[PDB]
Each structure stands twice: as structure tokens, then as C-alpha cells.
Amino acid sequence: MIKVEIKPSQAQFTTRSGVSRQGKPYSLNEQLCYVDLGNEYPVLVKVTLDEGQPAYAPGLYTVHLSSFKVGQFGSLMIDRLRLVPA
Amino acid sequence: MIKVEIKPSQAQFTTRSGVSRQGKPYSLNEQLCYVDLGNEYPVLVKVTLDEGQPAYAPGLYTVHLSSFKVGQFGSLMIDRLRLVPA
């Protein structure tokens, strides 16, 4: 299991916006977190939230299976890092 | 934890080869496996092995933390799926 932490300072998201190739509006909500990759300290990682989802509250989390998909070259990839409480 | 299985039919690797941009030879060893992504059946995934490593034997495995890295856009990515016995 991957240990992910939302610190008290990371309790909000920001939103970026634009227009798609064929005219549709989009909005993306992004939040920061710390992921422990086994180095001396955890590293900073950007998370893009799914539609209609609030910012994750401060606390400890792990990664949900729905974060992964098989890519176009047949290898596993992360689609979007989706988190669940630890 | 991600459940990965090497079936008895997947106990070998194949090797692809070529030459890099500035003249160096390379070889890549690839093995197939099944990863349970929570659908009705596990899906087929290609794994590229690290230098000097043998094919994983048939059995159950999970994913090692060293499989992940932060990408050039600041989001988590899989570098290479590295497996450890379950």
C-alpha cells in the first residue's frame, strides 16, 4: 500500500478552465498531497479530482484500484490517482 | 494492494532489441501477467523486466513501491511495474 497524506495546508483545491477542440467548456479541480515513495521524505504530488467530488480532508489515505488502467501499449498506467481513507 | 498473477503459461520472457539514437545497443525483456482491476475477470498486462533480472516464476505477487515516480507534470506515474511475492 501506498501511503498518501493530505496536510492541513493542502485542504483546498484550485480550478483550471478552458475550451475543448470542438467547443465544449471544461473545468479541472486540482489538489496537492504528499506520497511516500520510500525516500528520506515524502514527495509533493498533484491530484486531479473527479467531477462532482469535494477536496479530500486532511488525513491519511491509500490508493483505490480504480486509479489504474491498461494503456495503449499494453502496460499498466495511472489514469487518475483516486484516494480512499486509510 | 494490487493482486498480480503470473500463470503457468506466462513463465517465460521474450526479448526485443535495437540501437539508441547515438549508437548504443539495448535489450528489453518482456513478460505477460494478469492484474485484477476489479472487473469480472483479471486483465492481460505487459511487464518490462529490469536489467539482470530473471522472469518472475508462476504465482501471486503485489506491486513494489519502486514502480512509481513523479512525472514531468507533477502527477504520479508508473515507471515500470516491479513485483514482489505476495
UniProtKB/Swiss-Prot annotation, chains A, B:
One of its GO terms (biological process) is DNA replication. Binds to DNA in a highly cooperative manner without pronounced sequence specificity. During synthesis of the single-stranded (progeny) viral DNA, prevents the conversion into the double-stranded replicative form. G5P is displaced by the capsid protein G8P during phage assembly on the inner bacterial membrane. Homodimer. The record marks 41 as: Involved in DNA binding, and in the dimer-dimer interactions of the protein-ssDNA complex. This is DNA-Binding protein G5P. Keywords: DNA replication, DNA-binding. Signal peptide: none annotated. Belongs to the inovirus G5P protein family. The record marks 16, 21, 26, 34, 46 as: Involved in DNA binding. GO terms for molecular function: single-stranded DNA binding. InterPro entries: NA-bd_OB-fold, Phage_M13_G5P_DNA-bd. It comes from Enterobacteria phage f1 (Bacteriophage f1). It comes from the Viruses.
